[PDB]
Design a protein around this ligand. Structure first.
Ligand code: SF4
Length: 74
């Protein structure tokens, strides 16, 4: 199975609510906007693990997205 980053069981209800507010998804709807090209992403320690985010808590997929995506590209 591919890497999934939707296990929110270590988060508080309020932290989950923020993630939902921002429409976090593992599968970005946009070809050109993913967590991996967002300024707030923190890459994983292995490509076989989820990364993280400075803005929302919990596991974060590099192919994912939320509506607060902050462009890296100059
Ligand atoms: S701010 Fe949103 S798009 Fe950027 S890394 Fe975090 S979850 Fe992904």
């Amino acid at each position: 199975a591919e890497l999934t980053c939707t296990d929110v069981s270590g988060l508080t209800a309020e932290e989950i609510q923020m993630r939902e507010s921002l429409q976090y998804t593992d599968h970005s709807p946009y070809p050109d906007k993913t967590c991996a090209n967002c300024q707030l992403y923190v890459p994983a320690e292995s490509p076989d693990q989820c990364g993280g985010c400075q803005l929302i808590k919990g596991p974060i997929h590099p192919n994912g997205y939320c509506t607060s995506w902050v462009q890296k590209a100059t």
